[PDB]
Amino acid sequence: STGSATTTPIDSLDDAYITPVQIGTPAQTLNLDFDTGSSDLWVFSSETTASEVDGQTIYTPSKSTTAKLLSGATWSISYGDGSSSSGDVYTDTVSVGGLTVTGQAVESAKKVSSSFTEDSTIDGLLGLAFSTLNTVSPTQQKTFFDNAKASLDSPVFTADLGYHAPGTYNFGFIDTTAYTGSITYTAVSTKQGFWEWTSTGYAVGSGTFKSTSIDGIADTGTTLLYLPATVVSAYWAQVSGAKSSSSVGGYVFPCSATLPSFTFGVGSARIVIPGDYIDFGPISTGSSSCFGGIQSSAGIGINIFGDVALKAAFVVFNGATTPTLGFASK
């Protein structure tokens, strides 16, 4: 089997991407944030504290003839941006882009933190990291990809995120018309539960390429590109007026600037992030100070190849017995 679904930016800045998911019988369609950095499939629901719901579409398990309470199971998760959610668990039928899993753990939120309530366009998350990170207790549950894997034509999924435009998540096949050149594959460590790999270096604009190992994660659930302070300083030094602002919480730059590109290495291959991808607009409405899309990972404890990086590529998440990651230009 295979699946194919369009993923759409939630706003004009590509702050996140949502993908329609069918849950239950008859289908309840919710728009979920596909997240290769976490491993829980959770949804706003009829159980969510009423005051914490503001415009999201909810899953109501009592209206699904295939829903079953997973007795005694609870979940609770925190994300790197300070947000969190928790609740109980059902199993139900879940379909993405025509690919169906029966008995998928659907984690129903009883509580969500303020930034979820405030994000009316996101109805929940669909985790695509390794199932070892799944938070369900006392019986850990499998991701949608893990449950689907055996049935897929090939044990892979691909992320093709658009810049200011829709893109595609495919399951079970590689669309050879969706990228240019060849796909370069690179080793993955699953020791931390992530799609963790090592970039071979970087360049800033038309500058020379610096060969240096940068360990990090391919994370569709993180908006920006978080790299070591040395790398980030080298980038922003090429933008007149750019500075790290403690009060804002990162590098800002004059909105009048034209940003240089940023290149990262995948083995001997190179992925170029155009400068425009790195502009996240005014820090507040009407400001001429703009927020940068490349930020320091110091204090995160890991480097994160988030959407800013991944949307410059066609990315293969290869879930064979020994997982690997593939990157192509597009």
Torsion of CA 317, 318, 324, 330, to 10 degrees: -50
Contact 30, 44 (CB under 8 A): yes
Calpha distance 240→71 (Å, rounded): 58
Check 39, 85, 95, 199 and give the catalytic one: 199
Check 33, 35, 160, 219 and give the catalytic one: 35
Contact 87, 110 (CB under 8 A): yes
Nearest to 273 by CA among 302, 229, 307: 307
Instruction: Look up 35 and say whether it is catalytic.
Output: yes
3-state secondary structure of 57: coil
Count Cβ atoms below 10 Å from residue 119 Cβ, excluding itself. 20
Instruction: Look up 199 and say whether it is catalytic.
Output: yes
What is the radius of gyration, based on Cα positions, of the chain?
A: 20
Give every CB contact of residue 294 below 8 A, 6+ residues apart in sequence: 224, 225, 227, 232, 235, 236, 251, 262, 278, 308
Positions marked catalytic: 35, 199
